[PDB]
Design a protein around this ligand. Sequence first.
Ligand SMILES: Nc1ncnc2c1ncn2[C@@H]1O[C@H](CSCC[C@H](N)C(=O)O)[C@@H](O)[C@H]1O
Ligand SMILES: Oc1cc(-c2ccc(F)cc2)cc2nccnc12
Ligand SMILES: [Cl-]
Ligand SMILES: [Mg+2]
Length: 213
Amino acid sequence: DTKEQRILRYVQQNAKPGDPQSVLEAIDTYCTQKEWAMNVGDAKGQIMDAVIREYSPSLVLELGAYCGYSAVRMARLLQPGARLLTMEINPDCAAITQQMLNFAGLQDKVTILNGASQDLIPQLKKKYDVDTLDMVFLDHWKDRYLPDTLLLEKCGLLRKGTVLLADNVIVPGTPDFLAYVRGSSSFECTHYSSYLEYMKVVDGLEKAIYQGP
Ligand SMILES: Nc1ncnc2c1ncn2[C@@H]1O[C@H](CSCC[C@H](N)C(=O)O)[C@@H](O)[C@H]1O
Ligand SMILES: Oc1cc(-c2ccc(F)cc2)cc2nccnc12
Ligand SMILES: [Cl-]
Ligand SMILES: [Mg+2]
């Protein structure tokens, strides 16, 4: 089996169904003690929690689901009726994420889209009945942050005030995206310094609020 399957099995063996906090703790324990994995982690997760609570988004899009850690993190803090869409290109990870959210009891708040963000983003308005997004969490391959941001704009999915929150802007880094949003009059940017998941290595999140065309 794979690392991702081992994470899911550990959660099933150690966490409580319907208890998102126990799911997050089980994942963080496994990934601290057994095998490192690219979950956003508790340090950056706490910053995400604070941002989610501040903005109270009705509709959030996540790019990159992996095992569902960040989806559980965000979905547990959404207000009643608010929703998360998450895109995952790896079908095995899409299935693991669905099962993780099922285990956590958050399945009615989340839709997991199996496919590449660049193929799914253009279908959000027609197939998934999206008008505009309130928040986007970018946490997929780093070379897609800028192209997908530009694609979201082209597709009419951003509104004045849409909050982009980008993981890993220091490590591994996303140089084109970070330079672009910080240089653009269409974004108001703030940097939140933190640490790489499960490591004593500096990382950070960038918040970039869309200002319109
Ligand atoms: N173009 C794309 N569209 C959708 N998912 C993508 C993608 N490129 C990479 N990915 C996925 O992005 C994930 C990065 S890891 C995501 C971690 C997750 N947000 C968490 O914190 O828990 C991987 O599972 C990878 O398969
Ligand atoms: O949070 C992350 C961390 C890393 C990563 C990998 C290897 C290192 F050495 C350091 C950091 C990669 C990621 N890819 C996609 C989404 N999130 C990632
Ligand atoms: Cl951490
Ligand atoms: Mg990340």
